[PDB]
Each structure stands twice: as structure tokens, then as C-alpha cells.
């Protein structure tokens, strides 16, 4: 459950990372809005999941999916090249967030 | 691109209602910034911001019978040139 | 130069994940104080650090840093599982977070 | 246990001037949130939050020569244990 908050964090994290890119200097309202509400939730989802997880995993696994959110709309969305590099890396992160819930 | 179409909505001898297009969601900044003075220039002007939420904003104190100017800034220079229009209350 | 404001930029990540672990879900005040400041540090010499180094390379070793001491003050302030398993999937989580970051 | 010495530092009869010990500054919490209504009954109890940087807090809007009870909660009871009071304006 606080699993399930992390994942839910690093949504959150990834989608105001982007709409913050989208918003030029702040400017924006919708976008700088996104990302506004998205720091909130993404943070306060965090605080909670690390009220019962080990701070190093949990910061470790919302960092990881904020990079793997990040690379997945960047190929699906932004037009970014898929290399065999980001693919073996793709594989290692999502080994690593598995082995880690795995381990509980 | 961003605001268009000042336009006084209503007047007073000594407050101006104007409004602007705020555009489309895309185009919705966080803030306008509304300037207005003497159409010639005694000493300052007059200045504040409005959130970008609203499309219509008042000004009140000014001298009746005296042609204004009234620009609507966006944040940056980016979405546009600064909109203004001249009235005399 | 921005090299070691890129340093300080992840020593202030853990800074503030640590932080966040110590204020129980943003309630105690002064852990959740030392969170948004450190974020807003972070955050500001990270843009500091990046306007210079290449955004691969700085998120790269911005978030590796922020990770690594983080799983490390983990381990040792909340002493955190110091597993075989549990170091060796955080060693895949932080390659894969450091690869993806290093190819954007 | 936060808070500690909930008191009513000022009063008036439409009006309380609350005020209680956060404690040592490990025990600071990030907001206080404050509840009081009339100590008889007859409807709920008004409420609202207060930032954990403050010691004190007013309750206005009262009836004249009512007695209310007054609690102040942290945000949990980890730590926590809601202090009342009471006192008729
Ligand atoms: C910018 C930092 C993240 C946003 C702050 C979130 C504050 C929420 C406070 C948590 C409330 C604790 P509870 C158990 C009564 O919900
Ligand atoms: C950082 C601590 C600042 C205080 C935040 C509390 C805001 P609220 C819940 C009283 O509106």
C-alpha cells in the first residue's frame, strides 16, 4: 500500500516535471498549475509512504520512477530515440523497484 | 498572441471597468499585469497585477476628464506585445 | 567549478529526503522545514550547476548522489536493512536511474 | 505531550485570546488545529487549523456569557493528547 503511494507519488512526480517544461518561465497557468498540484501530491504521497518505508528505498524507487516516467513519455510522446543503452537501463530499473518490493 | 481585444466594458467620471480576451487554455497566463496613467505623463504612472484567472479588472481614482492609457502585460515579453488603449474618463 | 555546486546540489537531496523521513508526514515542523528548504537549495543549485554542465551528466550524478546517501543514511540514522538482496537491487535501481539519466 | 498550558491569555465577551506551550522544538509540529463550542451542546463545534510556529491563536465570534469548551490538537496523537479548556465569556 505504501508501494502503491510510491508508484503513485512518481506518477505525480513525472507528470509535474513535465507540465513544468510546458509552462515556460511559470507563466502558464493550466501548466504551471499541473505542475503546482503535482509537487503537492507527489511530496505529500512521499511523506506518507515514507512514514512506513525505509527512506533510502523509498526515495530510491520515486526517483526511479520519475526517470522511468520520464524516458517511457519521451519515446511515446516527445519523439525520443529508443537505444539499446535506455532499454538495458529501463530493464535494470524496473528489476531494481521489483527486487526491492520483493524484499519486503 | 496574448491578451487582445482591451476594451472599457463601463466608465465613471472616475473608474475605468476594461476586460481582455484571455485566449485559449493554452494561452492562460498565471498574470496580467495592468498599467495605467495620465495619457501624457505628469510624473508616474499606475500599476498592478491580476491574476490570470480573470479577464476584467477595475480602476478606480482617476481624474475625470483626462485621457488615459491603459496597458495589460502578460508575464513575459513571449506571448505578445503589451496591449493599450487610450480613454478619457 | 558548477562540478561541486552540482555536489552540493545532491548533498542537499539527501539532506532533505532525510529530513522528510524525521518530520512523520510533514507534521513535526523543523524536519518539514529543513525538507522544503533543502528542496528549494537543491533545486536552485541544481539549475546553478546545469546552466554550465551538461543536464545529462549533472541529473546523473545530481540523482546517483541523492540516492546513494540517502540508502546510506538510511542504513545508518533509521538503521535501514543492510541485506545482500535489498544493496544489490538498490545497486541495479541506482545504475538504471544514473544510466537513464546520463543518455537524455 | 504537545501542546502543553492551553490558557486564555485575553478575553472579551464576544472573544478569546488562546494560548498553550508548543513544546521543545522536536516536538513543533507543522499546524495546531483549534476547536471550541458551546460547552451545553444544542450543535456542533467550530473549527479551524492554526501554523505550528504559533503559540497562541483568537476565537472570535462568541456568544456573551456562554460557556465554550476549547481543545487543540496536533496533527496526530503520536506525541498527541488534546488539551481543553473551558471558559464562559
Ligand atoms: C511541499 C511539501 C508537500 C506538501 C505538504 C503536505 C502537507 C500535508 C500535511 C499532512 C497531514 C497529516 P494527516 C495524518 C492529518 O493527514
Ligand atoms: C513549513 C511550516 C509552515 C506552516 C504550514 C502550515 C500551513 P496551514 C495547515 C496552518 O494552513
Same mark, same amino acid.
Given at each position: %500500500?505504501?508501494? /502503491? ?23 502558464? /497557468?493550466?501548466?504551471? %498549475?499541473?505542475?503546482?498540484?503535482? %509537487? ?49 537501463? %529501463? ?14 | ?19 481582455? #480576451? ?8 498565471? +498574470? +496580467? ?8 505623463? *505628469?510624473? !508616474?504612472?499606475?500599476?498592478?497585477? @491580476? !491574476?490570470? +484567472? ?9 481624474? !475625470?476628464?483626462? #485621457? &488615459?492609457?491603459?496597458? @495589460? &502585460?502578460?508575464?513575459?515579453? #513571449? &506571448? ?5 488603449? *487610450? +480613454?478619457?474618463?
Amino acid at each position: %500500500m505504501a508501494w /502503491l503511494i510510491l508508484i503513485i507519488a512518481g506518477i505525480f512526480e513525472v507528470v509535474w516535471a513535465i507540465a513544468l517544461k510546458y509552462s515556460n518561465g511559470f507563466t502558464r /497557468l493550466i501548466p504551471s %498549475m499541473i505542475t503546482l498540484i503535482g %509537487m503537492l501530491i507527489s511530496f505529500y504521497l512521499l511523506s506518507q509512504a515514507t512514514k512506513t518505508l525505509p527512506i533510502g528505498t523509498a526515495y530510491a524507487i520515486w526517483t526511479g520512477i520519475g526517470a522511468l516516467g520520464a524516458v517511457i513519455c519521451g519515446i511515446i510522446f516527445f519523439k525520443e530515440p529508443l537505444t539499446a543503452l535506455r532499454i538495458v537501463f %529501463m530493464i535494470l530499473l524496473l528489476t531494481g523497484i521489483i527486487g526491492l518490493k520483493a524484499t519486503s | 498572441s496574448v491578451p487582445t481585444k482591451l476594451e472599457v466594458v463601463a466608465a465613471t467620471p472616475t473608474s475605468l471597468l476594461i476586460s481582455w #480576451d484571455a485566449g485559449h487554455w493554452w494561452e492562460w497566463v498565471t +498574470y +496580467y499585469r495592468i498599467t495605467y496613467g495620465e495619457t501624457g505623463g *505628469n510624473s !508616474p504612472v499606475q500599476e498592478f497585477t @491580476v !491574476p490570470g +484567472y480573470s479577464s476584467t479588472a477595475t480602476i478606480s481614482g482617476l481624474k !475625470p476628464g483626462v #485621457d &488615459y492609457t491603459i496597458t @495589460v &502585460y502578460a508575464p513575459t515579453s #513571449d &506571448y505578445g506585445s503589451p496591449i493599450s488603449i *487610450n +480613454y478619457r474618463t
